RNA sequence: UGACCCACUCGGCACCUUACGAGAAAUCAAAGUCUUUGGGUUCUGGGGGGAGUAUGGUCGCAAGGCUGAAACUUAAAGGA
RNA sequence: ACAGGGCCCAUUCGGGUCUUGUAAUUGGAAUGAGUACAAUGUAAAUACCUUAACGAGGAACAAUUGGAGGGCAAGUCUGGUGCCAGCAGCCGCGGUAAUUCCAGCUCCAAUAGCGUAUAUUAAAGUUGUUGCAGUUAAAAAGCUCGUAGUUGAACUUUGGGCCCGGUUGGCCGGUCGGAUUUCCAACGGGGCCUUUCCUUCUGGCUAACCUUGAGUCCUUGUGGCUCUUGGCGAACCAGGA
């Protein structure tokens, strides 16, 4: 075995829910992780940085090995988390999950010249953590993935393909860097352009649409 | 003094030098397409990076302005003649979705390979340096040539050459002068 | 958001607080969406039919909401009084 | 309203208040007095000719011990008196007193390298024939 | 009227809470909108010392200030 | 001559038949570096290119210079030394079994060329406009006024209407692999008109049709251009205002 928990778990095992875009519409939580295993399988992992700490005991120095993990596919779906642990083999691992509850859309789209098949972002975004400032900017076609090794990485998994970048921003902080960049793409969706204004009209929540299956 | 004659390098190196990232996609290139040195992957890289902006430059005129169309419709037809991008894609737009790898197939180096007349890619080349292949009745001795689409069908072997004519070829004025 | 030829090219269209036409961005938790209700012409709760509306997180934090709805089902077509556009 | 004048007629007060600032930034210090010609050995250069005196021994700076090999020179110019440093082996041997040597920097500017203290140059040639060879034995000396 | 209560606001002097952001971090509604790198402009620093000394030049009655070297030495000094 | 890395059988050998290989017996072929008749070349020779004669078996006709802890490819081989010699660009070895020194074997890197020192470059987003840092790391002047310097809210024809044509892209290839028409998308661009300066006057200039004196080859016609007469000025000469 999987097994389940909560009203939200049970549903997706059964399969009364299908896509991840249900879940960001009503904007649910997520506690269990299998919740996006069944759905998105495309998903692939990647390990960025394995560093030792340290919390320094009475005749010694303790250590763990922050990893930090990024996950996703191509299509507008990033995942990110940071679980210290001791020994690697919790530390990555129950990083990989840490990221998976944090899957987050993106909102690939056009530079200009509408054309056919999204390559770049919709708009300018920024992010901030402690020090770093990221100014993602939409670039025309295969221009390129203009940035550090790591950012490239994030941004591949999240296709996305092409976009100018810039930092500030101490980016010997692989960890506070990604923290930030992430908090910007996750924020394309958190920016009214004319093409949304056409008022959409609220569906109905899963939490009492399949209310009975959702319980014993 | 005299008109000081004019010249630009073609190469534009990389911004970071070393990477088990981009490196192990050159050696996937060389390789698969013949080539030689890294001073090829970076010639191209330049000449794509060249065209790429004359698009960017435009796009940002309006559309319809005299300059934008003219180049576009002159720009484009320069790439229809070299086979690079299709007919069906040329709006402008689109030339941008052209990666390194499309150009390479229209290098003579390889168009020979496809016109097999060559065991592998290699037997595709000595074959060019050694005066062997020919477009009109005319030899070409340089891998980097760039196939002009409307030639292509005229690609040989020439009279000169040993593999289509004027004589046997050196090592043969030897098996017949020791029985 | 769309292509050259009418192909909605997106993940989704975001849902937008109902009184505040901001946005609701995936992982909000704070996040509500109401399902009040209507009476039928009788002390009977009408079933499988209700109103809707949709709070950000935005305003849960600021006291706001209680006075934001008490604009809206008076402003819609059920309630009478409590509320004033002229304070 | 941060600290700078901003409106339209605020050319005058800007081309001044950068041209002042630049000062301090160290670099633009070298280039106006520029130091390069007056101070330092090479003046406005990169390389030069000199002729050796002694074969001095300079121990270490310390996280180290390391007794390295240095030579005083006599240049063939300001005359400063300089020291300089040798690479490879013993390298020392091949610099036989009052010989002709060809000096260059130490890629650091000014400054002062690794574990050596007041020291700022390397010995490239001798006689003009490499060191590089008069240690991989592609030539020899007169 | 006045004190008061509450409602609202504009301008303060701060504070809590988050972190979507930023950071080496400690922490920060600004240290945010920075490799997706650019709203306006004035100062400053570019290893540690030698030393804010020696020198000149200058303001002061003096204490002293502002200006400000180099030779030499050194693989670390430092931040959290 | 063995060693093999396969294969077809192995009821146990082991052979075997496609293969690299350690070899200290190996034998037939091949050349020019050097030497050198001649021709050449050369004003005159040297050389080159040619070529008769010659010239390859390891002790030759012998390839070196720099390392073999890390950086950084590669010796926890043997011998000596014992914080002394010495090495080491920096981290550092060495104070009795040294993976660093001296040296043997062994291997690694460049290789008719390697090293060595100096200067400069990239590395240097550690001089920076693109691209830095200034809460404590080295740095926001003690704070304010100011002549230069530097920046500086917005607003002064938009829209629409008709044209006509380019040359990319489709649909016919029209044909013994390119010529172009209807069908037709993209896209520029000149007209002209909707209250619409085009410094503008004297000629010559007209170049265009508001002209139309006649008309009709053919798909039962806003598909096709031969001709003088009233009248288009910026297709332009050339003096000025």
- Residue spans per domain, chain C: 1-87
Q: How remote is the C-alpha of A189 from its chain's centroid? A: 13
In chain A, ranges of CATH 3.30.230.10 domains: 108-196
Rounded Cα–Cα distance for residues D39 and D47 (Å):
16
Q: Is A115 on the interface with B (CB under 8 A)?
A: yes
CB distance A53 to A29 below 8 Å: no
The total of other beta-carbon atoms located within 10 Å of residue C18's CB is: 18
CB distance B91 to B128 below 8 Å: no
Task: List chain B residues with CB under 8 Å of A143.
Answer: 52, 96
Strand F positions closer than 7 A to protein CB: 64-67, 83, 86-94, 102, 112-125, 127-128, 131-133, 135, 137, 140-141, 147-153, 166-170, 177-178, 186-190
Of C10, C13, C33, the CB nearest to A205: C33
CB distance A200 to C15 below 8 Å: yes
Rounded Cα–Cα distance for residues A122 and C11 (Å):
13
- The residue with tokens 């981009």 is B22
Q: Nearest nucleotide, C1' to the C-alpha of B13?
A: F122
Give the up-direction half-sphere exposure of residue A120: CA atoms within 13 A in the CB hemisphere: 27
Inter-residue long-range contacts of C42-50, CB under 8 Å, 24+ positions, other chains counted: none
Q: List CB contacts of A92: < 8 A, sequence separation 6 or more.
A: A47, A50, A67, A69
CB distance C26 to A186 below 8 Å: yes
- The SS3 assignment for B144 reads coil
Evaluated on CA atoms A114, A115, A117, A121, the torsion sign reads negative
CB contact under 8 A, C16 and A199: yes
- The residue with tokens 């919390």 is A55
Alpha carbon of C60: minimum distance to chain A alpha carbons (Å): 16
CB distance B6 to B12 below 8 Å: no
Q: Nearest nucleotide, C1' to the C-alpha of D47?
A: F119
- The SS3 assignment for A8 reads helix
Rounded Cα–Cα distance for residues B26 and B101 (Å):
11
Q: What is the DSSP letter of A212?
A: T
- The residue with tokens 């950068």 is D18
Phi, psi dihedrals of residue B68, rounded to the nearest 5°: -55, -45
- The SS3 assignment for D123 reads strand
CB distance A32 to A6 below 8 Å: yes
Q: Cα–Cα–Cα angle for A191, A171, A127, nearest 5°?
A: 10
CB distance A4 to A216 below 8 Å: no
Phi, psi dihedrals of residue A41, rounded to the nearest 5°: -80, -35
The answer to whether the C-beta of D57 is closer than 7 A to strand F is: no
* CA closest to B60 among chain A residues: A112
CB distance B94 to B88 below 8 Å: no
Rounded Cα–Cα distance for residues B160 and B141 (Å):
14
The total of other beta-carbon atoms located within 10 Å of residue A178's CB is: 26
CB crowding B17-41: b at 16 or more within 10 Å, else e? eeeeeeeeeeeebbeebbbeeeebb
Rounded Cα–Cα distance for residues D109 and D120 (Å):
9
Rounded Cα–Cα distance for residues A113 and B93 (Å):
7
Q: Nearest nucleotide, C1' to the C-alpha of B90?
A: F169
CB distance A169 to A133 below 8 Å: yes
CB distance A64 to A72 below 8 Å: no
Rounded Cα–Cα distance for residues B158 and B139 (Å):
7
Terminal CA-CA length for chain C: 40
Of A115, A142, A143, the CB nearest to B93: A115
Evaluated on CA atoms C19, C20, C21, C26, the torsion sign reads negative
CB distance B160 to B137 below 8 Å: no
Architecture of domain A7-105: 2-Layer Sandwich (3.30)
**Alpha helices, DSSP H only, in B42-116?**
43-57, 66-69, 100-105
Alpha carbon of B53: minimum distance to chain A alpha carbons (Å): 9
Locate A140 and state its tokens: 């025309």
Terminal CA-CA length for chain A: 19
The total of other beta-carbon atoms located within 10 Å of residue D93's CB is: 12
Locate C25 and state its tokens: 């961005």
Rounded Cα–Cα distance for residues A213 and A215 (Å):
6
Question: Which one of A117, A142, A147, A156 makes the best mutation probe of the B interface by having the most chain B beta carbons within 10 Å?
Answer: A142
- The SS3 assignment for D17 reads helix
Architecture of domain C1-87: 2-Layer Sandwich (3.30)
> Whose CA is closest to D55, among D104, D101, D115, D113?
D101
**What dihedral angle (degrees, nearest 10) is formed by the CA atoms of A174, A179, A185, A187?**
-160
CB distance A53 to A30 below 8 Å: no
> Whose CA is closest to A40, among A93, A88, A9, A79?
A79
The answer to whether the C-beta of D94 is closer than 7 A to strand F is: yes
- Whether a cis peptide bond, with omega within 30° of 0, leads into A59 is no
Terminal CA-CA length for chain B: 64
Query: Between the CA of B5 and the C1' of F43, what is the distance in angstroms?
Result: 38
Of C4, C23, C26, the CB nearest to A192: C23
The answer to whether the C-beta of D8 is closer than 7 A to strand F is: yes
Q: Is the domain covering A108-196 a CATH 3.30.230.10 domain?
A: yes
- Strands A44-47 and D84-85, by their bridges, are unpaired
Query: Between the CA of B58 and the C1' of F144, what is the distance in angstroms?
Result: 51
Q: What is the DSSP string of D34-64?
A: -----SSSSS------EE-----B----TT-
Query: Between the CA of B75 and the C1' of F100, what is the distance in angstroms?
Result: 64
Question: Which one of A8, A25, A121 makes the best mutation probe of the C interface by having the most chain C beta carbons within 10 Å?
Answer: A25
The answer to whether the C-beta of B148 is closer than 7 A to strand F is: no
- The residue with tokens 């009977």 is C44
Of A76, A109, A196, the CB nearest to C13: A196
Cite the beta strand spans of chain D per DSSP E. 50-51, 70-71, 84-85, 100-103, 123-126
- The SS3 assignment for A128 reads coil
Rounded Cα–Cα distance for residues A56 and B140 (Å):
72
């Amino acid at each position: 075995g999987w097994v389940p928990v909560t009203k939200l778990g049970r549903l997706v095992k059964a399969g009364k829910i299908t896509t991840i875009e249900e879940i960001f519409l009503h904007s649910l939580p997520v506690k269990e992780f299998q919740i996006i295993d069944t759905l998105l399988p495309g998903l692939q992992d990647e390990v960025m940085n394995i560093k030792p700490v340290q919390k320094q005991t009475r005749a010694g120095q303790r250590t763990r090995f922050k990893a930090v993990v990024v996950v996703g596919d191509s299509n507008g779906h990033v995942g990110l988390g940071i679980k210290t642990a001791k020994e690697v083999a919790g530390a990555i691992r129950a990083g990989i999950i840490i990221a998976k509850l944090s899957v987050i859309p993106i909102r690939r789209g056009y530079w200009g010249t509408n054309l056919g098949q999204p390559h770049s972002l919709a708009t300018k975004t920024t992010g901030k953590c402690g020090s770093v400032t990221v100014r993602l900017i939409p670039a025309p076609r295969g221009s390129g993935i203009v940035a550090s090794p790591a950012v490239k990485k994030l941004l591949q998994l999240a296709g996305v393909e092409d976009v100018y970048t810039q930092s500030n921003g101490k980016t010997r902080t692989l960890e506070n860097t990604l923290k930030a960049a992430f908090v910007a793409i996750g924020n394309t969706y958190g920016f009214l352009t004319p093409n949304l204004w056409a008022e959409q009209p609220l569906p109905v929540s899963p939490l009492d649409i399949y209310s009975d299956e959702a319980s014993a | 003094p005299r008109a000081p004659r004019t010249y630009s390098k073609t190469y534009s190196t990389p911004k970071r030098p070393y990477e088990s990232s981009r490196l192990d996609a050159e050696l996937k290139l060389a390789g698969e397409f013949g080539l030689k040195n890294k001073k090829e992957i970076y010639r191209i890289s330049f000449q794509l990076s060249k065209i790429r902006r004359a698009a960017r430059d435009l796009l940002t005129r309006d559309e319809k302005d005299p300059k934008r169309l003219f180049e576009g419709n002159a720009l484009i037809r320069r790439l229809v003649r070299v086979g690079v991008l299709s007919e069906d894609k040329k709006k402008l737009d689109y030339v941008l979705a052209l990666k390194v790898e499309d150009f390479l197939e229209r290098r003579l180096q390889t168009q020979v390979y496809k016109l097999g007349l060559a065991a592998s890619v290699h037997h595709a080349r000595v074959l060019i340096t050694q005066r062997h292949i020919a477009v009109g009745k005319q030899i070409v001795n340089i891998p980097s040539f760039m196939v002009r689409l409307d030639s292509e069908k005229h690609i040989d072997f020439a009279p000169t050459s040993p593999f289509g004519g004027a004589r046997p070829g050196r090592v043969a004025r030897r098996n017949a002068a020791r029985k | 958001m769309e292509n050259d030829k009418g192909q909605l090219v997106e993940l989704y269209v975001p849902r937008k607080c109902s009184a505040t036409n901001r946005i609701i961005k995936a992982d909000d938790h704070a996040s509500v969406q109401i399902n009040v209700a209507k009476v039928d012409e009788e002390g009977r709760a009408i079933p499988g039919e209700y109103v809707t509306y949709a709070l950000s997180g935005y305003v849960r934090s600021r006291g706001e909401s209680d006075d934001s709805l008490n604009r809206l089902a008076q402003n819609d077509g059920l309630l009478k009084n409590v509320w004033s556009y002229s304070r | 309203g941060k600290g700078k004048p901003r409106g339209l007629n605020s050319a005058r007060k800007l081309r001044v208040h950068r041209r002042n600032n630049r000062w301090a930034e160290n670099n633009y210090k070298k280039r106006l007095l520029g130091t390069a010609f007056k101070s330092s050995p090479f003046g406005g250069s990169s390389h030069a000719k000199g002729i050796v005196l002694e074969k001095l021994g300079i121990e270490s700076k310390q996280p180290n011990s390391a007794i390295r090999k240095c030579v005083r020179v006599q240049l063939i110019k300001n005359g400063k008196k300089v020291t300089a440093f040798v690479p490879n082996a013993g390298c020392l041997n091949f610099v036989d007193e009052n010989d002709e040597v060809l000096l260059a920097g130490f890629g650091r500017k000014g400054k002062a390298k690794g574990d050596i203290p007041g020291v700022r140059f390397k010995v490239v040639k001798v006689s003009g024939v490499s060191l590089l060879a008069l240690w991989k034995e592609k030539k020899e000396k007169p």
